[PDB]
Design a protein around this ligand. Structure first.
Ligand SMILES: Nc1ncc(/N=N/c2ccccc2)c(-c2ccc(Cl)cc2Cl)n1
Length: 208
Protein backbone atom coordinates (compact mmCIF):
# COMPACT_ATOMS: atom_id res chain seq x y z
CA UNK A 1 0.00 0.00 0.00
CA UNK A 2 1.30 3.32 -1.33
CA UNK A 3 0.99 6.65 0.55
CA UNK A 4 0.88 9.86 -1.57
CA UNK A 5 2.32 13.19 -0.32
CA UNK A 6 2.26 16.78 -1.58
CA UNK A 7 5.66 18.43 -1.93
CA UNK A 8 6.00 21.50 0.30
CA UNK A 9 4.95 24.63 -1.77
CA UNK A 10 8.54 25.84 -2.30
CA UNK A 11 9.85 22.44 -3.43
CA UNK A 12 7.08 22.06 -6.02
CA UNK A 13 8.10 25.50 -7.31
CA UNK A 14 11.75 24.53 -7.29
CA UNK A 15 10.94 21.43 -9.28
CA UNK A 16 9.08 23.35 -12.09
CA UNK A 17 11.81 25.89 -12.32
CA UNK A 18 14.27 23.07 -13.04
CA UNK A 19 11.90 21.31 -15.42
CA UNK A 20 10.85 24.49 -17.26
CA UNK A 21 13.91 26.72 -17.49
CA UNK A 22 15.97 26.59 -20.73
CA UNK A 23 19.36 25.52 -19.45
CA UNK A 24 21.70 23.43 -21.63
CA UNK A 25 24.27 22.45 -18.97
CA UNK A 26 22.37 19.46 -17.49
CA UNK A 27 25.44 17.34 -16.69
CA UNK A 28 25.73 19.00 -13.33
CA UNK A 29 22.95 16.70 -11.99
CA UNK A 30 25.48 13.89 -11.59
CA UNK A 31 28.00 15.49 -9.28
CA UNK A 32 25.09 16.73 -7.11
CA UNK A 33 23.93 13.11 -6.60
CA UNK A 34 27.46 11.70 -6.18
CA UNK A 35 28.23 14.38 -3.58
CA UNK A 36 25.02 13.56 -1.75
CA UNK A 37 26.44 10.01 -1.58
CA UNK A 38 29.76 11.23 -0.37
CA UNK A 39 27.99 12.99 2.55
CA UNK A 40 25.89 9.88 3.44
CA UNK A 41 29.03 7.67 3.43
CA UNK A 42 30.87 10.28 5.58
CA UNK A 43 28.03 10.10 8.02
CA UNK A 44 28.04 6.30 8.55
CA UNK A 45 31.81 6.15 8.82
CA UNK A 46 31.82 8.74 11.55
CA UNK A 47 28.97 7.00 13.43
CA UNK A 48 30.60 3.56 13.15
CA UNK A 49 33.71 5.07 14.85
CA UNK A 50 31.87 5.19 18.19
CA UNK A 51 29.71 2.14 17.55
CA UNK A 52 31.09 -0.43 15.22
CA UNK A 53 27.93 -2.62 15.04
CA UNK A 54 26.58 0.09 12.70
CA UNK A 55 28.56 -1.53 9.86
CA UNK A 56 26.87 -4.91 10.53
CA UNK A 57 24.71 -4.11 7.43
CA UNK A 58 27.77 -3.71 5.23
CA UNK A 59 31.42 -2.68 5.62
CA UNK A 60 32.18 -1.40 2.12
CA UNK A 61 31.81 2.31 1.56
CA UNK A 62 31.47 2.89 -2.13
CA UNK A 63 29.54 4.52 -4.95
CA UNK A 64 28.33 2.72 -8.12
CA UNK A 65 27.03 4.24 -11.37
CA UNK A 66 24.82 1.86 -13.36
CA UNK A 67 23.39 2.63 -16.83
CA UNK A 68 20.78 0.33 -18.31
CA UNK A 69 19.84 1.18 -21.85
CA UNK A 70 17.04 -1.32 -21.85
CA UNK A 71 15.11 0.38 -18.93
CA UNK A 72 16.72 3.73 -19.88
CA UNK A 73 17.82 4.40 -16.27
CA UNK A 74 20.99 5.55 -14.63
CA UNK A 75 21.19 4.39 -11.02
CA UNK A 76 23.47 6.07 -8.46
CA UNK A 77 24.04 3.59 -5.60
CA UNK A 78 25.78 4.13 -2.27
CA UNK A 79 26.24 2.20 0.95
CA UNK A 80 26.11 5.33 3.12
CA UNK A 81 23.80 5.98 5.96
CA UNK A 82 20.44 5.46 4.21
CA UNK A 83 17.34 7.41 5.16
CA UNK A 84 14.43 6.68 7.49
CA UNK A 85 10.80 7.05 6.60
CA UNK A 86 10.63 10.41 8.39
CA UNK A 87 13.63 11.74 6.47
CA UNK A 88 12.11 10.70 3.14
CA UNK A 89 8.74 12.25 4.04
CA UNK A 90 9.21 15.11 6.51
CA UNK A 91 12.86 15.76 7.38
CA UNK A 92 14.31 16.25 3.84
CA UNK A 93 11.37 18.50 3.07
CA UNK A 94 11.67 20.69 6.17
CA UNK A 95 15.38 21.47 5.37
CA UNK A 96 15.39 21.98 1.62
CA UNK A 97 12.73 24.62 2.48
CA UNK A 98 15.29 27.44 3.27
CA UNK A 99 17.78 26.23 0.70
CA UNK A 100 15.01 26.67 -1.90
CA UNK A 101 14.33 30.25 -0.86
CA UNK A 102 17.96 31.36 -0.84
CA UNK A 103 18.54 29.52 -4.15
CA UNK A 104 15.64 31.24 -5.73
CA UNK A 105 16.62 34.65 -4.58
CA UNK A 106 20.16 34.03 -5.91
CA UNK A 107 18.57 32.95 -9.21
CA UNK A 108 17.97 36.67 -10.02
CA UNK A 109 21.24 38.31 -9.27
CA UNK A 110 22.38 35.94 -11.97
CA UNK A 111 23.25 32.78 -10.08
CA UNK A 112 22.44 29.94 -12.36
CA UNK A 113 21.14 26.45 -11.83
CA UNK A 114 24.58 24.84 -11.39
CA UNK A 115 24.91 26.68 -8.07
CA UNK A 116 22.02 24.61 -6.64
CA UNK A 117 24.33 22.37 -4.58
CA UNK A 118 25.74 25.29 -2.57
CA UNK A 119 22.18 25.81 -1.33
CA UNK A 120 21.74 22.14 -0.25
CA UNK A 121 19.18 21.05 -2.82
CA UNK A 122 21.45 19.41 -5.39
CA UNK A 123 19.19 16.38 -5.53
CA UNK A 124 16.34 18.08 -7.30
CA UNK A 125 18.68 18.80 -10.18
CA UNK A 126 18.04 15.17 -11.15
CA UNK A 127 14.89 16.59 -12.85
CA UNK A 128 17.15 18.32 -15.36
CA UNK A 129 17.43 14.83 -17.04
CA UNK A 130 14.86 12.43 -15.38
CA UNK A 131 11.13 12.39 -15.95
CA UNK A 132 10.59 10.13 -12.93
CA UNK A 133 13.10 9.66 -10.05
CA UNK A 134 12.83 6.63 -7.72
CA UNK A 135 14.88 6.45 -4.42
CA UNK A 136 15.24 3.10 -2.76
CA UNK A 137 16.78 3.57 0.65
CA UNK A 138 17.57 1.56 3.75
CA UNK A 139 18.68 2.96 7.18
CA UNK A 140 19.87 0.78 10.14
CA UNK A 141 16.92 2.05 12.14
CA UNK A 142 14.07 1.41 9.77
CA UNK A 143 12.79 -0.73 6.93
CA UNK A 144 13.74 -0.39 3.25
CA UNK A 145 11.58 2.21 1.55
CA UNK A 146 10.89 3.32 -2.00
CA UNK A 147 10.25 7.08 -2.61
CA UNK A 148 9.16 8.09 -6.14
CA UNK A 149 8.14 11.23 -8.03
CA UNK A 150 7.44 12.50 -11.51
CA UNK A 151 7.18 15.99 -10.10
CA UNK A 152 3.88 17.62 -10.76
CA UNK A 153 3.75 18.35 -7.05
CA UNK A 154 3.20 14.91 -5.42
CA UNK A 155 5.40 12.05 -4.22
CA UNK A 156 4.74 8.50 -3.11
CA UNK A 157 6.34 6.46 -0.38
CA UNK A 158 5.86 2.70 0.06
CA UNK A 159 7.92 0.10 1.94
CA UNK A 160 10.20 -1.63 -0.63
CA UNK A 161 9.85 -5.35 -1.49
CA UNK A 162 12.73 -5.54 -4.10
CA UNK A 163 16.16 -7.06 -3.61
CA UNK A 164 17.10 -6.08 -0.03
CA UNK A 165 20.03 -3.71 -0.06
CA UNK A 166 21.69 -3.94 3.33
CA UNK A 167 22.12 -0.16 3.96
CA UNK A 168 22.40 2.83 1.67
CA UNK A 169 20.59 4.70 -1.10
CA UNK A 170 19.86 4.00 -4.75
CA UNK A 171 18.83 6.91 -6.97
CA UNK A 172 17.25 5.51 -10.16
CA UNK A 173 16.89 8.19 -12.85
CA UNK A 174 14.19 7.37 -15.38
CA UNK A 175 15.75 9.53 -18.11
CA UNK A 176 13.90 11.79 -20.57
CA UNK A 177 13.85 10.40 -24.12
CA UNK A 178 16.37 13.10 -25.19
CA UNK A 179 18.85 12.68 -22.31
CA UNK A 180 20.15 9.18 -23.04
CA UNK A 181 23.67 10.46 -23.62
CA UNK A 182 24.08 9.89 -19.83
CA UNK A 183 23.84 6.15 -20.33
CA UNK A 184 27.06 6.13 -22.26
CA UNK A 185 30.28 5.03 -20.81
CA UNK A 186 32.60 7.65 -22.34
CA UNK A 187 29.97 10.34 -21.53
CA UNK A 188 29.78 9.31 -17.84
CA UNK A 189 33.54 9.10 -17.18
CA UNK A 190 33.95 12.51 -18.85
CA UNK A 191 31.55 14.04 -16.33
CA UNK A 192 32.93 12.16 -13.32
CA UNK A 193 36.48 13.02 -14.43
CA UNK A 194 35.57 16.69 -14.84
CA UNK A 195 33.38 17.12 -11.73
CA UNK A 196 33.96 14.44 -9.11
CA UNK A 197 37.61 13.34 -9.23
CA UNK A 198 38.46 13.95 -5.61
CA UNK A 199 35.57 12.05 -3.98
CA UNK A 200 36.89 10.20 -0.92
CA UNK A 201 35.37 6.83 -1.86
CA UNK A 202 35.69 4.33 -4.73
CA UNK A 203 33.29 5.14 -7.61
CA UNK A 204 32.68 2.27 -10.06
CA UNK A 205 31.11 2.81 -13.50
CA UNK A 206 29.44 -0.55 -14.33
CA UNK A 207 29.58 -1.43 -18.09
CA UNK A 208 26.47 -2.74 -19.95
N1 LIG B 1 22.76 9.25 -1.56
C1 LIG B 1 22.05 9.84 -0.57
N2 LIG B 1 22.13 9.33 0.69
C2 LIG B 1 21.45 9.88 1.71
C3 LIG B 1 20.65 10.99 1.49
N3 LIG B 1 19.93 11.58 2.53
N4 LIG B 1 20.45 11.72 3.65
C4 LIG B 1 19.73 12.31 4.69
C5 LIG B 1 20.21 12.23 5.99
C6 LIG B 1 19.49 12.82 7.03
C7 LIG B 1 18.30 13.49 6.76
C8 LIG B 1 17.83 13.57 5.46
C9 LIG B 1 18.55 12.98 4.42
C10 LIG B 1 20.58 11.53 0.11
C11 LIG B 1 19.74 12.72 -0.20
C12 LIG B 1 20.05 13.96 0.34
C13 LIG B 1 19.25 15.06 0.04
C14 LIG B 1 18.14 14.94 -0.79
CL1 LIG B 1 17.14 16.40 -1.14
C15 LIG B 1 17.79 13.72 -1.35
C16 LIG B 1 18.55 12.59 -1.08
CL2 LIG B 1 18.11 11.01 -1.80
N5 LIG B 1 21.29 10.92 -0.86
Amino acid sequence: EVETFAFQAEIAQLMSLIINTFYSNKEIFLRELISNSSDALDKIRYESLTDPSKLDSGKELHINLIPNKQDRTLTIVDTGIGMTKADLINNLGTIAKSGTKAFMEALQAGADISMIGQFGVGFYSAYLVAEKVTVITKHNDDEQYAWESSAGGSFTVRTDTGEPMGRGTKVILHLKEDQTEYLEERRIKEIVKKHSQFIGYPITLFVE
